[PDB]
């Protein structure tokens, strides 16, 4: 149970951090990380799915004209094998 929120920033690194807190949490997450630097894009990406592989869940990667929106699902459903 949770409301998916929808966190429009233009700095990735504290939408990984907030991402982390409601992963934990076992809450749904969506963030948009609004820029076309590809470099920090890359950042976002590889630590989104980096989390997702730690804690065992999935993410849905979207580009919104040019600005990567990722939700990540903390409560996917029921299956407690580790990945």
Excluded at 21 to 46: P, W
Aim: charged share 35%.
């Amino acid at each position: 149970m949770g409301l998916t929120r929808t966190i429009t920033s233009q700095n990735k690194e504290e939408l990984l951090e907030i991402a982390l807190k409601f992963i934990s949490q076992g809450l749904d997450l969506e963030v948009e990380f609004d820029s076309t630097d590809d470099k920090e894009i890359e950042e976002f990406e590889r630590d989104m799915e980096d989390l997702a592989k730690k804690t065992g869940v999935q993410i849905q990667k979207q580009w919104q004209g040019n600005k990567l929106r990722i939700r990540l699902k903390g409560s996917l459903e029921h299956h407690h094998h580790h990945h």
